Each structure stands twice: as structure tokens, then as C-alpha cells.
Nucleic acid binder design. Structure first.
Length: 1364
RNA sequence: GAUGAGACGCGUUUUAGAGCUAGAAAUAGCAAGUUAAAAUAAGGCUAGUCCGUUAUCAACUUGAAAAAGUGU
């Protein structure tokens, strides 16, 4: 008949349940396909799908870009060879051929083993004359003599293959390369960022200090010595340390809880910098960027040491000098070692396995490791001066190819290449003819806006061709339609506003955006002068004055500058108090002051006609990074400004994107008011509404406008709808799975669509890493509050962050060790006698946070009202609460709630606020999921153009079902099994349907669609529970979940009574039977047969481990190339199995080669997958199988389920390992007992029920033994781990007299033995139980393979024993 | 809150850099090392200075494929 679906969506699981009108879960008979004797199964319509997390596309992206880079570099070399070919043919016939076959061994090499000249003599002569390529290069730059064309090619190819970075635009100059200028730019950025107590550096000689050859710390200290006002541990000092190559910690600089260390050389610098910036804002971005630039400058100056006469080729010459110095230091070192320390000489120069010099050259030992190894050796010997000063400076026995070379610009290599081409120009005419060609090969770089040079068959490419010919670096300008390509690039890179589609998002550094956020922060500011004694929000004229006078004059605006230079100067206000903002304004007009600094025309910046122009400029500077396209898009504004300001404007760059569009900020308009969002921000009368409040407020047309615009025109794919969502690929996977689950479920019900689909987005439980974070935050809160107040409670009563987890103790320190309602001190060691009271009663709102809790000796002190605490207490305690407020012991809202009786008490607006707080879902992703399901379910229409909604999609908060569990003892213990997902889905269905039955008029709150909004008057009564069933009022008490309860305890202690049967007032429908329905729910939760399905997946990804192992005679290794034998060349190891396969055939055995029929489980690697799926029989026959049955070849992905004896189940993890496949179903009584036993001390409830719960735990001690018996039988049946079971049984016997709480906790830990999935090690008391793995996989070959549908309701069971 | 475009430098693996002197070998004494080529998922056809590690995937039937169907 009629039914509804409950859903619990997660990132690794999807819970689902089908309920009837009586809140019951149907049990149905399902057909069983396959080849067994089972043709039918009885199943409950409840279950949960399990699956591995979806992965982000980052790794794939990195790999892809890397491949493109390798390809394009190789293509550059091919261009060079293409130019050199014809003239090389006259010089050497097999030069390039010999170069190509360099990797091959002499056996597979058709030509001479000697690459360059083909004969050993010229090769030896060459290598002796030039021990590095830089020698040859430096010669080719400095020799007028005719040179061999082959060596010329070697130089050019070396310069092209490793061409250097493109971080610097234009010609190389000291302004953007020298240490001094970049240091000045750095301190300029610093002073710009601060301007209050800034550092001024004019006399300083940054080059002489930073570029000097000394140790890092001493260089840092030497720079610090020139700055008396700043210190090494300061922010600037840490920046310098960062630029030098150290690892500074910025934790102390910002008082962050977690230490934040940054190292530029470290590969993980970027995401760390992004985290830090995420914490402190993107204003400091340019600062760290300047630090990076300075670092590159210092490194580049450190390598280019040969600045003696500045002749020739400085880079190559410097590498030469490094070679010479290396030789000298080496021979000197060998001399010293041989002289003083004859022993262990072999370990240093021959062993190489323990990071010696031989390990430094022939082994995998870095420079820092080599330094670390030889440091004590140098310390022990004498005459080791000079070698150590070079070692500490990281310039001892350096190689020419190191990690430092990243700082080398391409302009240098361009210089040497131009030089060489110029030197050999007249000798070889084709160098003169093809000079610009080679130079173009080195200098050409594909722009971001052009992308992959594809021709239609690339998923990632978008570029447009103005011709049909192969793109080269030389004809790129005349073949690539840069305009259309840039346009497509723009269309792709512009994301759309999540709030408002069909509207492009503005840049993060847009002027209108900065105006928006500035006014948004400014509108929430209240000021109190001397006389009015009441807080007043800023008026429109005041806001405009503040913006124009302050925000358009300074980058940073502080409260002191605000009161001093505005209120006192213009408003003539001597004393002012501000609550809205803290120390300064977080928002700023950065772009405004940037452009002001650039063009130096202030009036032009304030013309409202030039807004679109400036926005266009900012958009252009945000989108592109290439100089030419920027010049093209800024050519229209050439008449506006010229010369210096134009170039400087083109040099300016912006990065980042906002979240909002222009049409949202200052486009859509309220019908009645005629004011946009920004207009409301600037002027809104007495009360000032922020952005989120205008979106929220239903009194305006904005919410309607945002909603009606959400659906894009036409209907696209499901995949696109999911892709458009704002969430991780994991939750998107979960969403898709959820949709499919709904489809199968409605198929099961004879294609009848449900009345309701209730949705919950499962919350991620504490990762415990934040479990220390909360204690740290509350601890810091306590210390700051104490330091502010001045009561040395921490002295007389010392505490640590661990003990502060207790509610009453935390409140004790929060309340200055004083009673909240009474003027008396609290008893430190009698907190058990003390009660925790709610400021807003549970009858009105379910808020158990610290925000709504107080500690007092008796909650009778709150007074006689069923409301907030009385006025008689507020008037008395207002001062103390005001002292606790400004000391940050409590929040503003808590103070507002404590002093609500002074303002009349609770109101209809407050109660409505409570209802909206309980019933509405803030998460956007959930609303979008509900939108998807609604769109998929309802597709019928009528005669008019009206949408018929047959299926209602209800959205629920997790708090409702969670509190539902806690209030009526339907307790959850995740460690037992995976049933709790399904259970959560069921309870969601129940609560959702109950709520839609009880309050149909509140449909607009949870249900997706365009409904009658309704108001606050019709829902909430004026006062009391007046006239039952004689009024239209739905509820006087603002808590929606009260009708489930039999009794309602107010803040007085008075017990209100509710009927045994709850019914709707308007339609006279029974919504809840407090006996039978709770009995039904408990019965459902007690059912042992729940459909748990693990999604089977083919493994995808890299072929194997990426480490290239050296050559060995083993045949296990995989060839790097099909021609390259691993025995001679080496290869990869540890392949990854995509899936396994079941094969029945025959093989050759013995000398007689007799065929024996076999049934085996073969693993198909990801590499082998293509070949196997292309033609399986030939693949298997090549593998060695004979007479294969193509029909019986069975695909077995990971987590393939098999059933064996006595209902024992195993999942296929790999070709050679299994996982546990069974779920231990534990009775509800044991679950509740375990919860109550574990949650013994932390009950957090009223004493009456709590004591009864304690007694409930104590009375049922036998439950421990019963549970152990359950686990024992279950393990003996399906786990089969006798040793571990014996160990945990004995360990259980040892601690029988132990307290029930810890014992129950250890049983909860013990559940890991029986958990579904891969075996894991767990700790039981003192005993540690290691995993009992299932290494054997043969039993599967004769078990029953179970093919499960997504819900598990449809089964296809294959008895593999019958196959053979 | 996901998805994308450009580029650099290491790393690793083979080969090229002739090891020299004794001793029947076994094994001993030293001389030197810094660089380069090439590969960097095997590969694919659509042959692009493109694509190849994300997403997606129970079984069966029908389809080249998107996708439809099959079970009170």
C-alpha cells in the first residue's frame, strides 16, 4: 500500500528504510536467481549500502600535467634536431641515432657504444677536455675558433632541454633580480601592510649582508643586527629566515593553537601557506610572495658567484668554479683523512651503503645527509678549518645539478644560447638563417588561456584554430586564434554563484566586492556616546562619511582612528564606545588604494560612471597572466591614461575569485522598497540588516527571487546536477548512490512512488584530533577570562585542559567560581550537589550547549516563571553578568538570554526563531539533494502550467533523530555493526512523517518546493495552553518534539501532561500512539536481519609502485618498456590488481605434459586489464591455460561476497586475501546496556532518571557475560580465530571484578574482532590482540558467490562448487 | 567546494666517462667520482607539440554506444 522512504546519506554509507503508515517496516519475499536450490528469501525493507570513499582528481591532474611537460620538452629537442638534421648529415651520419640508443646495452645497440663521436679516442679527449657540459658551453661562448657542430648541438640542446623558469617577465635586470631591490620591495609591502610602527630601511646594504658567504643563522642574525627595533623571532625576522631557507614558525606571531612551520624548499610548502593564509587572511599573500622572490634572488646570487670581471657566460663559469672548488676540497679531504684517520677509509669512499662520499655520488644520499654524516668526522680531526665554514654555508663538494637550480631564470640560458649562435653565426650560415627559430624554441611558452594544443579529441582543451596545420612555436601567433581561445577560456574559467545561477562571479579583488564587504562589516557597528545610554546602529550618512573619510584614505582602519578622526573631529564626540568591531576593520579597500597608487587620480576613482570600466580592468587583470592578451584588452583604455601609469597598470596582477555576483549585490531589487542589497547595506533605517539577513528575511522579495531563479532552464543530466553541487567527490558519490537506492526501492514497490522521502545528511563524528582542540580553546578562554577579571582562581585551584571536559567544572571556572543567580561562592568539592540549569527551558528549545547552560546550587533560584530567569534575579545579577560578558566568559547571545525578562520575556519572534532554528536546514548541499530527488520524483503536470507534486521531499536535521534516540533510549553504538545507518534512516522516516502529519502548515520549512510561507502569529499562541482543541494554535511551547513525550517538565518543576494519543487539530488524524508506536519503533530496531551491502568496485589507478628498482634476475619485475628486459634494464614491482577472475581450464603438469582440469582464481592487473578485456581466451592461453570455458569465466571485483558453511561469509579483498563478511546482530537490550554502562559518568541528565539509569546498569551485571557469550558463539561460527578468542576470554576472566563501565568500554573495543571488513588489531585492557588475517583464498572457489543489488533485496546466487 | 590551464628543478633507472699495479687464483694496495644521453606510468588511435592513475561499475537479457528492460 502507501509507504515512505527514509535516507541517511554519508560519504562511506547510505542508510535506507521503507515505512508504512503505522511506522512499520514491511517484510517481503524476493525471488532468488542463480543455480542454487534457493528460489526465495524473506527480507526486511531496511538496510545500508557501504562503499569506499570517492577520490579527488588532484593526483591524476599532477600526473597529467607532468606527462604534458615531458612530451613538450622532448618535442622541443625534436625541433632542434629537425633544424640540425640536414647539415648534420654532412658532418656525422649516426650522431642522433647514437644519441637515441644511449639507454640500450651494447648488445641491443646496433651502433658504437660511444655516443658523441662514435670512437673511444675523441670521446676520451672530449670528456677530459670538458668534464661538464658547462665547460663546453663556456668555451662556445668564449671561442672565436671553429667548433664541431655536434658539440654546438650538445650545448644548444642542453640549454633547451633544461631552459629554466619563466617567473620573470621581460629582459633580465637588477630591478627584478638583485637582492637589494627585492628586499626594498619586501619592506615596502611590509610597511604598506602595517604603516603603524613600520620598519624603514634606506641605509641598509641588503646585498652585502644577505649574499655574503656565511651560515644561515649567522646571516639572519647579521641582518637583525642592522635592525635594533626588530628581532630574529619577530614576524619580519621569520620572513627573512624563510627567505634564507630556514624553517621559521609563525605560531607565536599569531598566537595560533597549532604550530605552523614553513619551508620554501619543502614540497609541502604551498598547501601550508594556503592554510596559514586561510587563518590570517589573503592580505599577507603578497608578503610571503615577496619573501619567495627574495629567496630565489638570494639563491641565484649564491650560484652566480663568478661576478669577478663579469665576462663570458657567468652561469657556466660559476658552475666551472664550483667544479674546481669541489676538486680542491675533495683532494684536500682525502689527504686529511688518509693522513689522520687511516681506518674506516673504505666506509667513506667505497661502501656507499651508509651514506659516505660514495653514497653521495653513486648512492641515494642528499647533500644534507652527506653533510650530516661527515660533520663529526671533520669535528674529530685537526686542520679541518675552512672546510667547515663551507659546509655550514651549504657549499661543500656541491654538484652542478641540484635542487637550487630552480631559481635560474630562462633569460640566462637565452643569453648563452644567443652568444653561442652569434659566435658560430658566420661559420655556419644556417645558424644565421635559423637563429630566431632556435631562440624562439627556447623562449616560447604556452599561455594559460590557450591550453592544450588539441584538435577536438581532448576533454581538457578549448582553444580555437584559425587554420588547419601543425602548431609550431614559430607559426603559433598566426595559426592560433588567441581572441576566440581567450574568450572560450573566459567562459570556462568563470564560475557561477551558488546563490544565483546564470550570473558570473566577480573577482576577489573587485571594487564593488570590496565595497560590499566593507559596508557589510560597517553596517553591524553600534556606537554609544555620553548621554543616550542606548546602543545605536550607524546611519547611512555616518556610514558614507566613514567610508569616504577613512576607508578611502587608509588601507587599515582601527577603532582608535575611527573615534579620534571621525567622532571627535566631525561629530564632536569626546567619548565613544563601539561593540560592532574589535581592534580594526577586517575588510579593506585594497584595490582602491592600489589603483590610487598606480594612476594617481582620486576623482576618477569615485565617478560612478567609470565603475564598469574599472571592473573590466580588474576582471582582465584577474583572468590573465600573459602580457600580450593583457595589452590587447587594455588597448581600449589607452586614451584614458598613458606612459608610466599604463605600463605599471599592466604590471599589476590579481588572483582569486569571490562567491557573489554583481546582479546579487546590486542588481535584484525589492518590489516594495526599491532598494538593492548594497542599498540596504548602506541605508536601512534604525535596524541594520546584513547580507545573510536579507537572504533570510521573508518580508522582502529577495528570498523568492533567489529561489525562483535556482532552477536552470531545460533539464540536463543527473551527472551534471551532481557535478554542479558544492561538496567533495565522496559525498557526490554518496548522493548518486542515494538516488539509485531510491530508484530501486520504488521499483520494488511495484513502481509506486512514496508519499514522503525523508533525508538526513549524516554528521562526521569527532576525529578526536579536535578533541584536544576544544579543550585547548576552552582553556585559553578560561585563562584570558581570568587575566581580564583578576581573580587568581587558577592559583588556588590549578587545572589542566583534560579535567576541563567536565560540564559542571567548566561552568564553575566560566562563572568565576560563583553562583549565577545567587551572590555566593560555589563549593569546589561539592559540585555533585549543584545543578546545571537551562537559561531557555527545554520545553521551548532543545539547546544543551554551554551557550544556554548555567551552574547553581539550586535551579529554584531562576524563579517562578516558566520563562527566562525572573526580573528579580536579573536586576540583582545584571552587573556580574555584564562583568562576565566583557571578560569573554560568556557570549553576547547568552547575556541576551539571561537578561530577557528585563525586556518583557520570551516573545513570539523568539519562539518563531526557535522553531526555525530546530526545523530548517542551513546546509545548501542538502537543499540541492532534496531538489534533485524532487525533480526526479515529480514530473507530472496538469491542464495549466502548474507542477504536480505527488512526492514530498522532507529535509531533517540530525539533531532531531539524535535527541529522539537519547530521550526514549533508542541508543546508538557504532562499534557493534553497520546497522546504525539503516536505523538512522528508519528513525528519520518516522520522525519526518510524524512531523508532516502533526504540522502540515509548517511544510514550507522542511519540504522542498514553492509553498505558502505563513507567518508567526497563526502558529504560536499568545499565552498559556488556553482552550485545547478550541483554537487554531499549534503549540504554545516552541519545541516541536514535545508531542512524542508523555510528560513535559518545565523550568519550575511543574509537570504538564500530554494525551496518550497525539492527533492533528485540523484534519483529526492520529499522528502518534505513545504505546504501540514506540513499541513498533523498538521492535524495528530490534530486528536482526538488516540488508548490509558493500559496493563491489574494480580497482583503478597507477599500474604499480612508482619506485624504479635496479636490474635483477627475478622475473617478477615489470618492464619499463616492452623492449627493455628487466633483467638488463630493471623495472617496476608490486602490481595492482584491478579485479580477480574465475577460470576453469586445464594445464600442463609433469614431464609428460599431461593435462589436469583446474579451477583457479587469477588476478588481472590494471595494466593487463585492457589486454584481458580485449580478448580473454587468448590472454589466458598466453598465461598458460588450455581449453578455457568462455561461459564460466567469472568477473570478481573487490569485496565480492561469498557464503560458506553455517552462514559464514567472506569478502574478496584481493587474489590472495579475504575479509570478514558477517554482521553481528546484538539485541537492543545489550546495546542500551553497553551505552548506559559506557556513558555512566557523562549522563548529562536530570538526577532522577540518571540514578535510575545507574541502578539499571548495576542490576544487569549478567549482561556482560551474556554479551561475551554472544561474541564467543558468533566468533566460533564465522570469524574462526581460536587464539584471539582464547586470549580475550581469559583476559575477560581476569578482570571480572573490575568496574562495569571500563569493562563495557573494553567490550566495545572487543567488538573489533567481529566487525565487518578487514581484520584490525585492537586493545582489550592490558592485552593487545593482533589481526588474524585470512591469507587462504581457495575455499572461495567452492563457496556460494552472492551477487547483490544496491539494496541487497535482489540476489543472484551462484554455487561455484557446481562449476568444474 | 569542487573542476581546469602554463612552467621549472630534483629524484630514479640503463649506458657513455678506457681504472692503474701486483698474485696460480682467491684476494689485496691505490688512482678517480661533480657530467651527459635516454626513459619517466606499459601504451592508445583519433596521429593531436592529443589522450593514458578522477568520476563511473551487482547479475541476466537487448544494444556499437548513451541506455532500456527482467523478480507478487
Amino acid at each position: 500500500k502507501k509507504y515512505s522512504i527514509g535516507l541517511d546519506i554519508g560519504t562511506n554509507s547510505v542508510g535506507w528504510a521503507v515505512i508504512t503508515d503505522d511506522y512499520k517496516v514491511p517484510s517481503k519475499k524476493f525471488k532468488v536467481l542463480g543455480n542454487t536450490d534457493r528460489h526465495s528469501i524473506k527480507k526486511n525493507l531496511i538496510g545500508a549500502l557501504l562503499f569506499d570513499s570517492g577520490e579527488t582528481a588532484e593526483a591524476t591532474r599532477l600526473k597529467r600535467t607532468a606527462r604534458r611537460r615531458y612530451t613538450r620538452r622532448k618535442n622541443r629537442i625534436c625541433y632542434l634536431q629537425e633544424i640540425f638534421s640536414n647539415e648534420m648529415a654532412k658532418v656525422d651520419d649516426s650522431f642522433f641515432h647514437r644519441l637515441e640508443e644511449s639507454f640500450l646495452v651494447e648488445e641491443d645497440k646496433k651502433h658504437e657504444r660511444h655516443p658523441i663521436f662514435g670512437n673511444i679516442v675523441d670521446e676520451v679527449a672530449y670528456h677530459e677536455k670538458y668534464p661538464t657540459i658547462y665547460h663546453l658551453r663556456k668555451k662556445l661562448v668564449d671561442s672565436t675558433d671553429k667548433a664541431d657542430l655536434r658539440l654546438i648541438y650538445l650545448a644548444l640542446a642542453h640549454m633547451i632541454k633544461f631552459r629554466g623558469h619563466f617567473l620573470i617577465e621581460g629582459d633580465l635586470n637588477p630591478d627584478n633580480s638583485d637582492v637589494d631591490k627585492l628586499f626594498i620591495q619586501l619592506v615596502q609591502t611590509y610597511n604598506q601592510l602595517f604603516e603603524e610602527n613600520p620598519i624603514n630601511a634606506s641605509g641598509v646594504d641588503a646585498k652585502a649582508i644577505l649574499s655574503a658567504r656565511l651560515s644561515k643563522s649567522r646571516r639572519l642574525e647579521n641582518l637583525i643586527a642592522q635592525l635594533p627595533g626588530e628581532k630574529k623571532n619577530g614576524l619580519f625576522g621569520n620572513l627573512i629566515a624563510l627567505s634564507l631557507g630556514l624553517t621559521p614558525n609563525f605560531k607565536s606571531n599569531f598566537d595560533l593553537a597549532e604550530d605552523a612551520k614553513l619551508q620554501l624548499s619543502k614540497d609541502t610548502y604551498d598547501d601550508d601557506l594556503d592554510n596559514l593564509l586561510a587563518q590570517i587572511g589573503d592580505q599577507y599573500a603578497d608578503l610571503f610572495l615577496a619573501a619567495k622572490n627574495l629567496s630565489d634572488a638570494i639563491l641565484l646570487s649564491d650560484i652566480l658567484r663568478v661576478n669577478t670581471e663579469i665576462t663570458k657566460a657567468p652561469l657556466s663559469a660559476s658552475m666551472i668554479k664550483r667544479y674546481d672548488e669541489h676538486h680542491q676540497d675533495l683532494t684536500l679531504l682525502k689527504a686529511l683523512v688518509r693522513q689522520q684517520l687511516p681506518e674506516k677509509y673504505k666506509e667513506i669512499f667505497f661502501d656507499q651503503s651508509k651514506n659516505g662520499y660514495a653514497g653521495y655520488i653513486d648512492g641515494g644520499a642528499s647533500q644534507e645527509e652527506f653533510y650530516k654524516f661527515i660533520k663529526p668526522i671533520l669535528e674529530k680531526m685537526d686542520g679541518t678549518e675552512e672546510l667547515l665554514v663551507k659546509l655550514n654555508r651549504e657549499d661543500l663538494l656541491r654538484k652542478q645539478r641540484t635542487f637550487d637550480n630552480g631559481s635560474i631564470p630562462h633569460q640566462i640560458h637565452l643569453g648563452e644560447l644567443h652568444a653561442i649562435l652569434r659566435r658560430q653565426e658566420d661559420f655556419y650560415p644556417f645558424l644565421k638563417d635559423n637563429r630566431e627559430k632556435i631562440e624562439k624554441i627556447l623562449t616560447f611558452r604556452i599561455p594559460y588561456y590557450v591550453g592544450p594544443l588539441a584538435r577536438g579529441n581532448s576533454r581538457f582543451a578549448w582553444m580555437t584554430r584559425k587554420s588547419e596545420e601543425t602548431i609550431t612555436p614559430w607559426n603559433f601567433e598566426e595559426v592560433v586564434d588567441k581572441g576566440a581561445s581567450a574568450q572560450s577560456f573566459i567562459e570556462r574559467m568563470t564560475n557561477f554563484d551558488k546563490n544565483l545561477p546564470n550570473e558570473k562571479v566577480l573577482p576577489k579583488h573587485s571594487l564593488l566586492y570590496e565595497y560590499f564587504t566593507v559596508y557589510n562589516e560597517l553596517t553591524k557597528v553600534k556606537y554609544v556616546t555620553e548621554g543616550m545610554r542606548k546602543p545605536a546602529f550607524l546611519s547611512g550618512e555616518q556610514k558614507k562619511a566613514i567610508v569616504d573619510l577613512l576607508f578611502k584614505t587608509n588601507r587599515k582602519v582601527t577603532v582608535k582612528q575611527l573615534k579620534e578622526d571621525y567622532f571627535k573631529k566631525i561629530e564632536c564626540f569626546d567619548s565613544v564606545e563601539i561593540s560592532g568591531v574589535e581592534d580594526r576593520f577586517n575588510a579593506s579597500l585594497g584595490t582602491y588604494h592600489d589603483l590610487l597608487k598606480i594612476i594617481k587620480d582620486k576623482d576618477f576613482l569615485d565617478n560612478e560612471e567609470n565603475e564598469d570600466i574599472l571592473e573590466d580592468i580588474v576582471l582582465t587583470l584577474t583572468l590573465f597572466e600573459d602580457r600580450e592578451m593583457i595589452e590587447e584588452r587594455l588597448k581600449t583604455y589607452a586614451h584614458l591614461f598613458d606612459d608610466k601609469v599604463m605600463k605599471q597598470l599592466k604590471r599589476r596582477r590579481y588572483t582569486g575569485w569571490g562567491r557573489l555576483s554583481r546582479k546579487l549585490i546590486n542588481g535584484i531589487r525589492d518590489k516594495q522598497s526599491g532598494k538593492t542589497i548594497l542599498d540596504f547595506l548602506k541605508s536601512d533605517g534604525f535596524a541594520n540588516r546584513n547580507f545573510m539577513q536579507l537572504i533570510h528575511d521573508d518580508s522582502l522579495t529577495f528570498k523568492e527571487d533567489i529561489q525562483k531563479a535556482q532552477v536552470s532552464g531545460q533539464g540536463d543530466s543527473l551527472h551534471e546536477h551532481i557535478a554542479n553541487l558544492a561538496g567533495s567527490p565522496a559525498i557526490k558519490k554518496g548522493i548518486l548512490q542515494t538516488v539509485k537506492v531510491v530508484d530501486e526501492l520504488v521499483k520494488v514497490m511495484g513502481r509506486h512512488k512514496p508519499e514522503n522521502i525523508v533525508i538526513e545528511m549524516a554528521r562526521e563524528n569527532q576525529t578526536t584530533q579536535k578533541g584536544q582542540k576544544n579543550s585547548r580553546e576552552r582553556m585559553k578562554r578560561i585563562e584570558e577570562g581570568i587575566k581580564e577579571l583578576g581573580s587568581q582562581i587558577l592559583k588556588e585551584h590549578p587545572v589542566e585542559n583534560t579535567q576541563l571536559q567536565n560540564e559542571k567544572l567548566y561552568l564553575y571556572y566560566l562563572q568565576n567560581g560563583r553562583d549565577m543567580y545567587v551572590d555566593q561562592e560555589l563549593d569546589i568539592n561539592r559540585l555533585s550537589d549543584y545543578d546545571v540549569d537551562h537559561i531557555v527551558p527545554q520545553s521551548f528549545l532543545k539547546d544543551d550547549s554551554i551557550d544556554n547552560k548555567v551552574l547553581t546550587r539550586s535551579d529554584k533560584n531562576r524563579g517562578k516563571s516558566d520563562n527566562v530567569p525572573s526580573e528579580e534575579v536579573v536586576k540583582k545579577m545584571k552587573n556580574y553578568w555584564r562583568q562576565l560578558l566583557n571578560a569573554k566568559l560568556i557570549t553576547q547571545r547568552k547575556f541576551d538570554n539571561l537578561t530577557k525578562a528585563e525586556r518583557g520575556g520570551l516573545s513570539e519572534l523568539d519562539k518563531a526563531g526557535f522553531i526555525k532554528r530546530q526545523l530548517v536546514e542551513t546546509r545548501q548541499i542538502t537543499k540541492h539533494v532534496a531538489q534533485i530527488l524532487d525533480s526526479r520524483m515529480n514530473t507530472k503536470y496538469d491542464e495549466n502550467d502548474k507542477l504536480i507534486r505527488e512526492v514530498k521531499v522532507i529535509t531533517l536535521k540530525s539533531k532531531l533523530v539524535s535527541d529522539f534516540r537519547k530521550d526514549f533510549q533508542f541508543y546508538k553504538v557504532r562499534e557493534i555493526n553497520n546497522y546504525h545507518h539503516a536505523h538512522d534512516a528508519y528513525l528519520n522516516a518516522v520522525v519526518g512523517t510524524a512531523l508532516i502529519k502533526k504540522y502540515p502548515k509548517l511544510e514550507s520549512e522542511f519540504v522542498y518546493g514553492d509553498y505558502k510561507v505563513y507567518d508567526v502569529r497563526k502558529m504560536i499562541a499568545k499565552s498559556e495552553q488556553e482552550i485545547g482543541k478550541a483554537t487554531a494554535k499549534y503549540f504554545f511551547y516552541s519545541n516541536i518534539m514535545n508531542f512524542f513525550k508523555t510528560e513535559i517538565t518545565l523550568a519550575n518543576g511543574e509537570i504538564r501532561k500530554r494525551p496518550l494519543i497525539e492527533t492533528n487539530g485540523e484534519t483529526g488524524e492520529i499522528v502518534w500512539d505513545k504505546g504501540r508506536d514506540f513499541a513498533t519503533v523498538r521492535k524495528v530496531l530490534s530486528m536482526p536481519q538488516v540488508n548490509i551491502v558493500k559496493k563491489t568496485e574494480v580497482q583503478t589507478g597507477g599500474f604499480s609502485k612508482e619506485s624504479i628498482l635496479p636490474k635483477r634476475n627475478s622475473d617478477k619485475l615489470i618492464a619499463r618498456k616492452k623492449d627493455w628486459d628487466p633483467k638488463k634494464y630493471g623495472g617496476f614491482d608490486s602490481p595492482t590488481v584491478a579485479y580477480s577472475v574465475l577460470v576453469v581450464a586445464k594445464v600442463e603438469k609433469g614431464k609428460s605434459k599431461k593435462l589436469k582440469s583446474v579451477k583457479e582464481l587469477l588476478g588481472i592487473t590494471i595494466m593487463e586489464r585492457s589486454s584481458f578485456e580485449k580478448n580473454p581466451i587468448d590472454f589466458l592461453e598466453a598465461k598458460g591455460y588450455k581449453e578455457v570455458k568462455k561461459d564460466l569465466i567469472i568477473k570478481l571485483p573487490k569485496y565480492s561476497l561469498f557464503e560458506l558453511e553455517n552462514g559464514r561469509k567472506r569478502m574478496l579483498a584481493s587474489a590472495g586475501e579475504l575479509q570478514k563478511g558477517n554482521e553481528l546482530a546484538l539485541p537492543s537490550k545489550y546495546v542500551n546496556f553497553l551505552y548506559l554502562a559506557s556513558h555512566y559518568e557523562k549522563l548529562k541528565g536530570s538526577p532522577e532518571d540518571n540514578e535510575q539509569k545507574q541502578l539499571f546498569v548495576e542490576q544487569h551485571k549478567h549482561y556482560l557475560d551474556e554479551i561475551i557469550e554472544q561474541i564467543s558463539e558468533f566468533s566460533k561460527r564465522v570469524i574462526l580465530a581460536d587464539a584471539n578468542l582464547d586470549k580475550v576470554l581469559s583476559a575477560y576472566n581476569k578482570h571480572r571484578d573490575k568496574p562495569i563501565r571500563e569493562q563495557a568500554e573494553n567490550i566495545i573495543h572487543l567488538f573489533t574482532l567481529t566487525n565487518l571488513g578487514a581484520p584490525a588489531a585492537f586493545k582489550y585492557f592490558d592485552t593487545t590482540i593482533d589481526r588474524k588475517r585470512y591469507t587462504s583464498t581457495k575455499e572461495v572457489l567452492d563457496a556460494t558467490l552472492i551477487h547483490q543489488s544496491i539494496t541487497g533485496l535482489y540476489e543472484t546466487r551462484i554455487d561455484l562448487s557446481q562449476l568444474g
